PDB file of all heavy atoms in Angstrom:
ATOM      1  N   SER B  14    -190.610  36.758 123.449  1.00  0.00           N
ATOM      2  CA  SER B  14    -189.994  35.432 123.458  1.00  0.00           C
ATOM      3  C   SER B  14    -191.044  34.415 123.856  1.00  0.00           C
ATOM      4  O   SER B  14    -191.771  34.638 124.824  1.00  0.00           O
ATOM      5  CB  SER B  14    -188.841  35.390 124.454  1.00  0.00           C
ATOM      6  OG  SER B  14    -188.245  34.108 124.491  1.00  0.00           O
ATOM      7  N   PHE B  18    -187.504  26.429 126.559  1.00  0.00           N
ATOM      8  CA  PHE B  18    -186.396  25.671 127.089  1.00  0.00           C
ATOM      9  C   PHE B  18    -185.121  26.430 127.322  1.00  0.00           C
ATOM     10  O   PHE B  18    -184.063  25.803 127.327  1.00  0.00           O
ATOM     11  CB  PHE B  18    -186.071  24.579 126.130  1.00  0.00           C
ATOM     12  CG  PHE B  18    -187.089  23.531 126.099  1.00  0.00           C
ATOM     13  CD1 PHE B  18    -187.977  23.455 125.038  1.00  0.00           C
ATOM     14  CD2 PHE B  18    -187.175  22.617 127.138  1.00  0.00           C
ATOM     15  CE1 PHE B  18    -188.940  22.466 125.000  1.00  0.00           C
ATOM     16  CE2 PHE B  18    -188.125  21.629 127.110  1.00  0.00           C
ATOM     17  CZ  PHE B  18    -189.012  21.555 126.041  1.00  0.00           C
ATOM     18  N   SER B  19    -185.190  27.745 127.516  1.00  0.00           N
ATOM     19  CA  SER B  19    -183.975  28.520 127.518  1.00  0.00           C
ATOM     20  C   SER B  19    -183.610  29.017 128.886  1.00  0.00           C
ATOM     21  O   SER B  19    -184.477  29.381 129.658  1.00  0.00           O
ATOM     22  CB  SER B  19    -184.146  29.700 126.607  1.00  0.00           C
ATOM     23  OG  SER B  19    -182.882  30.209 126.262  1.00  0.00           O
ATOM     24  N   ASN B  20    -182.321  29.047 129.194  1.00  0.00           N
ATOM     25  CA  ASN B  20    -181.859  29.708 130.433  1.00  0.00           C
ATOM     26  C   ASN B  20    -181.363  31.119 130.197  1.00  0.00           C
ATOM     27  O   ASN B  20    -180.918  31.782 131.118  1.00  0.00           O
ATOM     28  CB  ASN B  20    -180.729  28.930 131.076  1.00  0.00           C
ATOM     29  CG  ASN B  20    -181.103  27.520 131.348  1.00  0.00           C
ATOM     30  OD1 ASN B  20    -182.243  27.254 131.670  1.00  0.00           O
ATOM     31  ND2 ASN B  20    -180.157  26.598 131.200  1.00  0.00           N
ATOM     32  N   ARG B  21    -181.385  31.525 128.936  1.00  0.00           N
ATOM     33  CA  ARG B  21    -181.245  32.907 128.540  1.00  0.00           C
ATOM     34  C   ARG B  21    -181.989  33.795 129.544  1.00  0.00           C
ATOM     35  O   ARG B  21    -183.191  33.635 129.765  1.00  0.00           O
ATOM     36  CB  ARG B  21    -181.792  33.069 127.093  1.00  0.00           C
ATOM     37  CG  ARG B  21    -182.087  34.491 126.608  1.00  0.00           C
ATOM     38  CD  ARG B  21    -182.826  34.547 125.274  1.00  0.00           C
ATOM     39  NE  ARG B  21    -181.886  34.668 124.158  1.00  0.00           N
ATOM     40  CZ  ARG B  21    -181.033  35.682 123.982  1.00  0.00           C
ATOM     41  NH1 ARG B  21    -180.983  36.688 124.858  1.00  0.00           N
ATOM     42  NH2 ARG B  21    -180.221  35.689 122.925  1.00  0.00           N
ATOM     43  N   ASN B  94    -188.481  40.127 123.114  1.00  0.00           N
ATOM     44  CA  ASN B  94    -187.325  40.155 122.224  1.00  0.00           C
ATOM     45  C   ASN B  94    -187.180  41.521 121.531  1.00  0.00           C
ATOM     46  O   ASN B  94    -186.065  42.036 121.386  1.00  0.00           O
ATOM     47  CB  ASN B  94    -187.352  38.984 121.219  1.00  0.00           C
ATOM     48  CG  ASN B  94    -186.933  37.631 121.836  1.00  0.00           C
ATOM     49  OD1 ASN B  94    -186.088  37.541 122.745  1.00  0.00           O
ATOM     50  ND2 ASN B  94    -187.518  36.567 121.315  1.00  0.00           N
TER      51      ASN B  94
ATOM     52  P    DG D   3    -184.941  38.631 118.518  1.00  0.00           P
ATOM     53  OP1  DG D   3    -186.283  39.165 118.174  1.00  0.00           O
ATOM     54  OP2  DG D   3    -184.243  39.104 119.752  1.00  0.00           O
ATOM     55  O5'  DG D   3    -185.109  37.070 118.791  1.00  0.00           O
ATOM     56  C5'  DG D   3    -185.252  36.112 117.715  1.00  0.00           C
ATOM     57  C4'  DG D   3    -185.251  34.732 118.320  1.00  0.00           C
ATOM     58  O4'  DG D   3    -183.935  34.143 118.192  1.00  0.00           O
ATOM     59  C3'  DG D   3    -185.548  34.776 119.817  1.00  0.00           C
ATOM     60  O3'  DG D   3    -186.390  33.684 120.168  1.00  0.00           O
ATOM     61  C2'  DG D   3    -184.176  34.688 120.455  1.00  0.00           C
ATOM     62  C1'  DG D   3    -183.443  33.804 119.477  1.00  0.00           C
ATOM     63  N9   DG D   3    -182.007  34.045 119.492  1.00  0.00           N
ATOM     64  C8   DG D   3    -181.370  35.222 119.808  1.00  0.00           C
ATOM     65  N7   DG D   3    -180.068  35.125 119.778  1.00  0.00           N
ATOM     66  C5   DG D   3    -179.831  33.796 119.456  1.00  0.00           C
ATOM     67  C6   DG D   3    -178.606  33.093 119.291  1.00  0.00           C
ATOM     68  O6   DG D   3    -177.449  33.522 119.389  1.00  0.00           O
ATOM     69  N1   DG D   3    -178.824  31.752 118.987  1.00  0.00           N
ATOM     70  C2   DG D   3    -180.059  31.164 118.838  1.00  0.00           C
ATOM     71  N2   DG D   3    -180.059  29.857 118.535  1.00  0.00           N
ATOM     72  N3   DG D   3    -181.208  31.810 118.975  1.00  0.00           N
ATOM     73  C4   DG D   3    -181.019  33.113 119.284  1.00  0.00           C
ATOM     74  P    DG D   4    -186.638  33.267 121.668  1.00  0.00           P
ATOM     75  OP1  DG D   4    -188.114  33.276 121.841  1.00  0.00           O
ATOM     76  OP2  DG D   4    -185.748  33.992 122.625  1.00  0.00           O
ATOM     77  O5'  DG D   4    -186.074  31.785 121.637  1.00  0.00           O
ATOM     78  C5'  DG D   4    -186.498  30.835 120.655  1.00  0.00           C
ATOM     79  C4'  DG D   4    -185.606  29.621 120.756  1.00  0.00           C
ATOM     80  O4'  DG D   4    -184.230  30.031 120.577  1.00  0.00           O
ATOM     81  C3'  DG D   4    -185.657  28.923 122.113  1.00  0.00           C
ATOM     82  O3'  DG D   4    -185.505  27.525 121.904  1.00  0.00           O
ATOM     83  C2'  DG D   4    -184.413  29.430 122.815  1.00  0.00           C
ATOM     84  C1'  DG D   4    -183.449  29.542 121.653  1.00  0.00           C
ATOM     85  N9   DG D   4    -182.334  30.463 121.857  1.00  0.00           N
ATOM     86  C8   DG D   4    -182.408  31.820 122.067  1.00  0.00           C
ATOM     87  N7   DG D   4    -181.237  32.383 122.201  1.00  0.00           N
ATOM     88  C5   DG D   4    -180.335  31.333 122.088  1.00  0.00           C
ATOM     89  C6   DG D   4    -178.909  31.326 122.150  1.00  0.00           C
ATOM     90  O6   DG D   4    -178.136  32.273 122.342  1.00  0.00           O
ATOM     91  N1   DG D   4    -178.397  30.046 121.970  1.00  0.00           N
ATOM     92  C2   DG D   4    -179.150  28.915 121.768  1.00  0.00           C
ATOM     93  N2   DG D   4    -178.467  27.771 121.632  1.00  0.00           N
ATOM     94  N3   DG D   4    -180.473  28.907 121.701  1.00  0.00           N
ATOM     95  C4   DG D   4    -180.996  30.141 121.872  1.00  0.00           C
ATOM     96  P    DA D   5    -186.115  26.571 123.002  1.00  0.00           P
ATOM     97  OP1  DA D   5    -187.309  25.989 122.370  1.00  0.00           O
ATOM     98  OP2  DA D   5    -186.307  27.366 124.221  1.00  0.00           O
ATOM     99  O5'  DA D   5    -184.927  25.523 123.146  1.00  0.00           O
ATOM    100  C5'  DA D   5    -184.113  25.207 122.009  1.00  0.00           C
ATOM    101  C4'  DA D   5    -182.889  24.423 122.422  1.00  0.00           C
ATOM    102  O4'  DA D   5    -181.765  25.314 122.611  1.00  0.00           O
ATOM    103  C3'  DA D   5    -183.008  23.630 123.720  1.00  0.00           C
ATOM    104  O3'  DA D   5    -182.231  22.441 123.591  1.00  0.00           O
ATOM    105  C2'  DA D   5    -182.387  24.554 124.755  1.00  0.00           C
ATOM    106  C1'  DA D   5    -181.298  25.264 123.962  1.00  0.00           C
ATOM    107  N9   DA D   5    -180.988  26.638 124.376  1.00  0.00           N
ATOM    108  C8   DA D   5    -181.884  27.670 124.500  1.00  0.00           C
ATOM    109  N7   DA D   5    -181.332  28.816 124.823  1.00  0.00           N
ATOM    110  C5   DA D   5    -179.980  28.520 124.917  1.00  0.00           C
ATOM    111  C6   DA D   5    -178.861  29.308 125.231  1.00  0.00           C
ATOM    112  N6   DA D   5    -178.933  30.606 125.526  1.00  0.00           N
ATOM    113  N1   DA D   5    -177.654  28.705 125.254  1.00  0.00           N
ATOM    114  C2   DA D   5    -177.584  27.405 124.949  1.00  0.00           C
ATOM    115  N3   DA D   5    -178.561  26.557 124.631  1.00  0.00           N
ATOM    116  C4   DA D   5    -179.750  27.184 124.634  1.00  0.00           C
ATOM    117  P    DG D   6    -182.345  21.411 124.767  1.00  0.00           P
ATOM    118  OP1  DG D   6    -182.531  20.091 124.155  1.00  0.00           O
ATOM    119  OP2  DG D   6    -183.352  21.927 125.707  1.00  0.00           O
ATOM    120  O5'  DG D   6    -180.972  21.415 125.568  1.00  0.00           O
ATOM    121  C5'  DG D   6    -179.733  21.718 124.918  1.00  0.00           C
ATOM    122  C4'  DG D   6    -178.791  22.309 125.936  1.00  0.00           C
ATOM    123  O4'  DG D   6    -178.976  23.745 126.013  1.00  0.00           O
ATOM    124  C3'  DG D   6    -178.999  21.798 127.362  1.00  0.00           C
ATOM    125  O3'  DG D   6    -177.721  21.626 127.964  1.00  0.00           O
ATOM    126  C2'  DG D   6    -179.583  22.996 128.082  1.00  0.00           C
ATOM    127  C1'  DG D   6    -178.818  24.073 127.377  1.00  0.00           C
ATOM    128  N9   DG D   6    -179.225  25.461 127.599  1.00  0.00           N
ATOM    129  C8   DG D   6    -180.497  25.981 127.668  1.00  0.00           C
ATOM    130  N7   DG D   6    -180.513  27.264 127.923  1.00  0.00           N
ATOM    131  C5   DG D   6    -179.175  27.605 128.048  1.00  0.00           C
ATOM    132  C6   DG D   6    -178.572  28.850 128.330  1.00  0.00           C
ATOM    133  O6   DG D   6    -179.118  29.937 128.543  1.00  0.00           O
ATOM    134  N1   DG D   6    -177.186  28.752 128.353  1.00  0.00           N
ATOM    135  C2   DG D   6    -176.469  27.601 128.133  1.00  0.00           C
ATOM    136  N2   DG D   6    -175.137  27.706 128.205  1.00  0.00           N
ATOM    137  N3   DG D   6    -177.019  26.432 127.874  1.00  0.00           N
ATOM    138  C4   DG D   6    -178.367  26.504 127.856  1.00  0.00           C
ATOM    139  P    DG D   7    -177.249  20.180 128.418  1.00  0.00           P
ATOM    140  OP1  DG D   7    -177.661  19.433 127.197  1.00  0.00           O
ATOM    141  OP2  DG D   7    -177.716  19.748 129.767  1.00  0.00           O
ATOM    142  O5'  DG D   7    -175.666  20.346 128.535  1.00  0.00           O
ATOM    143  C5'  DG D   7    -174.896  21.106 127.582  1.00  0.00           C
ATOM    144  C4'  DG D   7    -173.750  21.805 128.277  1.00  0.00           C
ATOM    145  O4'  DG D   7    -174.115  23.181 128.536  1.00  0.00           O
ATOM    146  C3'  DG D   7    -173.346  21.216 129.630  1.00  0.00           C
ATOM    147  O3'  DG D   7    -171.925  21.325 129.805  1.00  0.00           O
ATOM    148  C2'  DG D   7    -174.068  22.100 130.630  1.00  0.00           C
ATOM    149  C1'  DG D   7    -174.034  23.454 129.938  1.00  0.00           C
ATOM    150  N9   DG D   7    -175.143  24.340 130.290  1.00  0.00           N
ATOM    151  C8   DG D   7    -176.477  24.013 130.298  1.00  0.00           C
ATOM    152  N7   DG D   7    -177.247  25.006 130.646  1.00  0.00           N
ATOM    153  C5   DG D   7    -176.369  26.051 130.889  1.00  0.00           C
ATOM    154  C6   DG D   7    -176.623  27.383 131.291  1.00  0.00           C
ATOM    155  O6   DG D   7    -177.708  27.924 131.519  1.00  0.00           O
ATOM    156  N1   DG D   7    -175.447  28.111 131.423  1.00  0.00           N
ATOM    157  C2   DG D   7    -174.187  27.623 131.189  1.00  0.00           C
ATOM    158  N2   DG D   7    -173.181  28.491 131.361  1.00  0.00           N
ATOM    159  N3   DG D   7    -173.935  26.384 130.801  1.00  0.00           N
ATOM    160  C4   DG D   7    -175.066  25.660 130.668  1.00  0.00           C
ATOM    161  P    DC D   8    -171.062  20.731 131.048  1.00  0.00           P
ATOM    162  OP1  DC D   8    -169.726  20.446 130.440  1.00  0.00           O
ATOM    163  OP2  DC D   8    -171.795  19.675 131.812  1.00  0.00           O
ATOM    164  O5'  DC D   8    -170.913  21.938 132.073  1.00  0.00           O
ATOM    165  C5'  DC D   8    -170.627  23.247 131.576  1.00  0.00           C
ATOM    166  C4'  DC D   8    -170.827  24.262 132.671  1.00  0.00           C
ATOM    167  O4'  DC D   8    -172.144  24.833 132.574  1.00  0.00           O
ATOM    168  C3'  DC D   8    -170.719  23.699 134.087  1.00  0.00           C
ATOM    169  O3'  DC D   8    -169.554  24.261 134.676  1.00  0.00           O
ATOM    170  C2'  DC D   8    -171.950  24.227 134.799  1.00  0.00           C
ATOM    171  C1'  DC D   8    -172.477  25.292 133.862  1.00  0.00           C
ATOM    172  N1   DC D   8    -173.930  25.427 133.931  1.00  0.00           N
ATOM    173  C2   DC D   8    -174.490  26.670 134.249  1.00  0.00           C
ATOM    174  O2   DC D   8    -173.740  27.639 134.437  1.00  0.00           O
ATOM    175  N3   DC D   8    -175.835  26.784 134.338  1.00  0.00           N
ATOM    176  C4   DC D   8    -176.609  25.715 134.128  1.00  0.00           C
ATOM    177  N4   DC D   8    -177.930  25.872 134.224  1.00  0.00           N
ATOM    178  C5   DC D   8    -176.063  24.439 133.804  1.00  0.00           C
ATOM    179  C6   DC D   8    -174.731  24.337 133.731  1.00  0.00           C
TER     180       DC D   8
END
Side-chain angles (χ1 to χ4, degrees):
Chain B
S14 179
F18 289 104
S19 199
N20 304 325
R21 164 189 267 299
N94 283 327

